[PDB]
Design a binder for these strands. Structure first.
Ligand SMILES: Nc1ncnc2c1ncn2[C@H]1CC[C@@H](COP(=O)(O)OP(=O)(O)OP(=O)(O)O)O1
Ligand SMILES: [Mg+2]
Length: 598
DNA sequence: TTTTGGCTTTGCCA
């Protein structure tokens, strides 16, 4: 009983369609687009299709317009008024870039619901959903175009009807899992915030990147000249096999030539040191500067180059990642003798007259573990301002806690997180530099010093065995069917994944809730500012996320007002038995952030 | 096959 009604055919018909559209609590939306590239509301975007149920879809044609566009803008922007769209980020971005309509209100997406049902599953397309969840609409799939031809109006109407049908079985599957309130309050606003982040982009100064690239090229020239001096012949260094032959075959001994093995050989003859330096710098050149120099787009209104990341937001533990040129993977500051500090994060500058504001959670997963495990000792350590990764390193090495190097603190952090996430005695011995027996004794002392952590690990494994899944703080469930396998290795891996999911998913939920709260409070504080840089410079813009940090671009007169809001919201996102401490750093660029005491 | 998450196996960010 599939029917299409062209409401944009009569003035009275359009008026009445608007009248009973504004009164609907839930509706599904789809867009019709032609074959174009980056949009127009009369050339690329053909129109919209709206469905309320019963296989009846209403199609609005934006072709040959101001009156109908205004009515559609009034209906879509704060009409319940829940709008259900497939790929909410794509739909939001397309609407904003084509007709300047921002989806204000409650949004829903069957992709997010399907991910909530099983985070470890594969990202299924809309027809793949119809075959599984709602197979009664299988005949309607004939009409969602093909590989060659597709009618935008018919495809849009069919997509709207299918999406409405799917988010009527998905909303019932999510109610029995108690994830419905979580879906409508945390995940969907997080998707809207990620869409705003993608629209904003992050500034990127080519002038700084050019200087950095010149420095790395000069360093490669110097390193190749030095290495050829040690060998006397001109051999290629990018091929691992080239190092494998001749080099380290008779000169040295352990061919699995990686970073870890040659690090132990670094105190010896400095040939491995040169190779490690060359490999690090070459990897940086290949994977950071070159990919980032081609994906930049010149924003004319801001008169600057920006990078627009693409959020992935379909992960096992709820962590939010990006696509191919991942800005989150940019290496931090390192040193080159040449000394020169290669700050690759210094190339990400804000607009003309702003500062980068990054707020970071202090030991977020440690505090989540303290709250979950009710461990008194670690909880009382994380309420007095003493750095856990510094005191642990001081006790392990014997030095004073205030005289601990940053490199030593990172090692203590790695050791602590590994032992929490089930790192074996052999791995701890190989990493911390002691024998296996001493590493096992250290693990035993760690578990007998924090009585709550061991009990939490055991109880989490037992509950994963009992229920077959692990539930985070907000209620997100990850299914691990390998927790009852007869294979010891797979069972241990499932146990480690259970603990890691239980902690990391809770941390990610806290981060997402903090992001949503910050966006709401910023909108409340600055109601006359653009939502993003593609809408029309008061407030902040949320240009990046580092799975624990929230980087914002804000003006000179708004730095303090935005920092206070961000810190307060990060602290008050959730109430736990531990204190959520977040530190705010403001600077002229991402790589030049200085702590902002406040 | 014995910290894990993301991207690409090994190294960089979480
Ligand atoms: N090796 C590891 N294994 C497991 N989880 C890890 C990890 N390294 C980091 N994480 C997780 C845990 C936390 C999350 C943030 O990563 P940060 O390195 O920034 O740790 P943070 O506690 O914030 O250290 P601080 O900022 O006080 O120096 O990444
Ligand atoms: Mg942190």
């Amino acid at each position: 009983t599939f029917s299409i009604i062209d409401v944009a055919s009569d003035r009275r018909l359009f008026n009445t369609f608007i009248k009973e559209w504004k009164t609907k609590e839930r509706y599904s939306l789809a867009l019709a687009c032609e074959k174009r590239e980056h949009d127009s509301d009369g050339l690329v975007l053909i129109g919209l299709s709206v469905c309320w149920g019963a296989r009846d879809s209403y199609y609005i044609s934006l072709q040959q317009v101001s009156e109908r566009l205004g009515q559609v803008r009034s209906c879509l922007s704060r009409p319940g008024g829940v709008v259900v769209t497939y790929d909410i980020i794509q739909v939001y971005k397309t609407l904003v870039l084509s007709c300047g309509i921002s989806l204000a209100g409650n949004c829903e997406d069957p992709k997010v619901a399907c991910w909530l049902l099983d985070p470890g599953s594969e990202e299924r397309t809309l027809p793949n959903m119809v075959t599984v969840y709602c197979p009664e609409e299988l005949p309607l799939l004939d009409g969602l175009g093909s590989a060659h031809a597709h009618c935008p109006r018919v495809r849009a109407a069919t997509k709207s009807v299918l999406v409405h049908a799917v988010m009527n079985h998905l909303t019932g599957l999510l109610e029995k899992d108690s994830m419905l309130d979580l879906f409508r309050s945390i995940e969907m606003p997080s998707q809207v915030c990620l869409a705003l982040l993608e629209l904003n982009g992050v500034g990127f100064s080519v002038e700084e990147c050019e200087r950095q690239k010149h420095v790395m090229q000069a360093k490669l020239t110097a390193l190749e000249s030095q290495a050829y001096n040690l060998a006397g012949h001109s051999f290629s260094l990018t091929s691992i096999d080239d190092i494998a032959q001749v080099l380290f075959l008779e000169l040295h001994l352990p061919f699995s030539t990686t970073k870890d093995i040659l690090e132990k050989l670094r105190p010896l003859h400095p040939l491995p040191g040169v190779i490690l330096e060359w490999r690090r710098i070459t990897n940086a050149l290949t994977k950071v500067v070159f990919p980032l120099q081609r994906e930049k787009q010149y924003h004319p209104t801001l008169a600057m180059d920006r990078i627009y990341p693409i959020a992935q937001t379909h992960t096992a533990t709820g962590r939010v990642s990006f696509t191919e040129p991942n800005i989150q993977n940019v290496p931090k500051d390192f040193e080159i003798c040449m000394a020169f500090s290669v700050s690759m994060r210094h190339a990400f500058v804000p607009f003309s007259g702003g500062m980068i504001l990054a707020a970071d959670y202090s030991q977020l997963e440690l505090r989540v573990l303290a709250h979950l495990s009710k461990d008194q000792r670690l909880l009382q350590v994380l309420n007095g301002g003493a750095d856990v990764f510094r005191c642990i390193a001081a006790e392990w090495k014997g030095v004073d806690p205030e005289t601990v190097n940053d490199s030593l603190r990172q090692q203590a952090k790695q050791i602590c997180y590994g032992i929490i996430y089930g790192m074996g005695a052999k791995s701890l011995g190989e990493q911390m530099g002691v024998e296996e027996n001493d590493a096992a004794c250290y693990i035993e002392s760690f578990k007998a010093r924090y009585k709550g952590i061991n009990a939490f690990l055991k109880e989490t494994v037992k509950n994963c065995i009992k229920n077959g899944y692990v539930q985070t703080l907000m209620g997100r469930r990850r299914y691990l069917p390998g927790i009852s396998n007869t294979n010891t290795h797979i069972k241990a891996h499932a146990e480690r994944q259970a603990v890691n999911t239980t902690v990391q998913g809770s941390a990610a939920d806290i981060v997402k809730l903090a992001t949503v709260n910050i966006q709401k409070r910023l909108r409340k504080t600055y109601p006359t500012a653009p939502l993003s840089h593609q809408h029309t410079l008061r407030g902040a813009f949320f240009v990046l996320q580092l799975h624990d940090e929230l980087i914002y671009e804000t003006r000179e007169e708004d730095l303090i007002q935005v920092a206070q809001i961000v810190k307060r919201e990060m602290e008050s996102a959730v109430k736990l038995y531990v204190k959520l401490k977040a530190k705010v750093k403001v600077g002229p660029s991402w790589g030049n952030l200085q702590d902002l005491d406040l």
